[PDB]
Amino acid sequence: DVLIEWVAIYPQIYDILEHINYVPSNTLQRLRLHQPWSKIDYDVWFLYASDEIRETCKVKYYGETKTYGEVFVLENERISQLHRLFVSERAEHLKNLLFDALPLVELGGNVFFNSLVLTKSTQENLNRITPYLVQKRPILLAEGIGKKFLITQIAAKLGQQIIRIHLSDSTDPKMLIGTYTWQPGVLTQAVITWILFTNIEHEVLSVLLPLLEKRQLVIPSRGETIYAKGSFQMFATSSMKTKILGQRLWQILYQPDECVEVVSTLYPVLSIICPTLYSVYKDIFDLFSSKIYRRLCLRDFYKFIKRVAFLYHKVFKEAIDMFGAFIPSRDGFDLVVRNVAIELNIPPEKALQL
Amino acid sequence: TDTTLMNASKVLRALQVLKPILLEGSPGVGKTSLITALARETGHQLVRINLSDQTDLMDLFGSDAPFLAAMRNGHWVLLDELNLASQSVLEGLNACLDHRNEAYIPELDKVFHPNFRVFAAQNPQGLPRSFINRFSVVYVALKEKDMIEIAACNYHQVNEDWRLKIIKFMFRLQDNIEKDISGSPWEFNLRDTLRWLQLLNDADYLEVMVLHRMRTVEDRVRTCELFKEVFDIDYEPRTIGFSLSSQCFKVGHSLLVRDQKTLLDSQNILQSQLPVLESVITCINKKWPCILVGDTATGKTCILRLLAAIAGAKIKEMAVNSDTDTMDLIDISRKASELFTDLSQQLLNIVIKYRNFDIFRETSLYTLTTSQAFTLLQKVVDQLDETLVHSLGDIHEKARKLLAEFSASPAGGYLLKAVEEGHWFVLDNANLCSPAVLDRLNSLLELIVNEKTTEDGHPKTIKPHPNFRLFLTVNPVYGELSRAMRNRGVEIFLLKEALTEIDKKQMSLLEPAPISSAVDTLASNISYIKYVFETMGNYMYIAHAIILALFSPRQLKLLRKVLTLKNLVQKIYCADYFNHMDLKASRFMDIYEYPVQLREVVGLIQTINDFQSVILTSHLELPETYASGLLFVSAHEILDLTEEVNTYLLKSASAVYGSTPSLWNLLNQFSKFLIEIASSNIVYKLDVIRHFLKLVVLWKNIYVWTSRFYCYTKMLGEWMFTKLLESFLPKDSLEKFSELQ
DSSP annotation string for B471-501: EEE--SSSPPPPHHHHTTSEE--------HH
Residue pair A155/A194 in contact by the 8 Å Cβ criterion: yes
Rounded to the nearest angstrom, the gap between the alpha carbon of residue A270 and the centroid of all alpha carbons in its chain is: 32
Distance CA B662, CA B660 (A): 7
Residue pair B84/B439 in contact by the 8 Å Cβ criterion: yes
- Specify which residues B22 forms β-bridges with: B120, B137
Instruction: Choose the closest CB to A50 out of B319, B508, B519.
Output: B519
B265 vs chain A: nearest CA distance in angstroms? 8
Q: Is A143 annotated as a binding residue?
A: yes
A243 vs chain B: nearest CA distance in angstroms? 12
Burial code (b: 16+ CB inside 10 Å, e: under 16) for B439-471 equals bbbbbbbeeebbeeeeeeeeeeebeebebbbbb
Helical spans, DSSP H, in B38-119: 66-72, 89-97
Interface test with A, best of B264, B269, B314 (most A CBs within 10 A): B264
Q: Give the Cα-Cα-Cα angle B701, B703, B707 (nearest 5 degrees).
A: 95
Residue A242: closest C-alpha in chain B: B477
Max CA distance (Å), chain B: 129
Distance CA B517, CA B528 (A): 8
Cβ neighbours of B313 (radius 10 Å):
26
Cβ neighbours of B55 (radius 10 Å):
21
Burial code (b: 16+ CB inside 10 Å, e: under 16) for B185-223 equals eebbbbebbbbbbebbeeeebbbbbbbbbbbeeebbebb
Residue pair B472/B319 in contact by the 8 Å Cβ criterion: no
User: What phi, psi does B32 have (nearest 5°)?
Assistant: -60, -35
How far is the CA of B598 from the CAs of A154, B254, B521, B670, in angstroms? 61, 11, 18, 40
Contacts 24+ apart (CB under 8 A), A13-22: A13/A95, A13/A111, A13/A112, A13/A113, A13/A134, A14/A95, A14/A98, A14/A99, A16/A113, A16/A114, A17/A99, A17/A103, A17/A113, A19/A229, A20/A103
If you write DSSP's letter for every residue of B582-624 in order, what string do you get? SSHHHHHHHHHHSS---SS---SHHHHHHSTTTTTTT--HHHH
A48 vs chain B: nearest CA distance in angstroms? 6
- Residue A331 at interface with chain B, using a CB cutoff of 8 Å: no
Residue pair A235/A160 in contact by the 8 Å Cβ criterion: no
- Residue A48 at interface with chain B, using a CB cutoff of 8 Å: yes
User: What phi, psi does B292 have (nearest 5°)?
Assistant: -85, 60
A69/B523 Cβ within 8 A:
yes
Distance CA A235, CA B130 (A): 56
Q: Give the Cα-Cα-Cα angle B179, B184, B185 (nearest 5 degrees).
A: 60
Residue B57 DSSP one-character state: G
A247 contacts on B by Cβ (under 8 Å) = 296-297
Distance CA A140, CA B347 (A): 42
Residue B323: closest C-alpha in chain A: A203
Q: B231: which residues sit within 8 A by CB, 6+ positions away?
A: B165, B169, B207
- Residue A88 at interface with chain B, using a CB cutoff of 8 Å: no
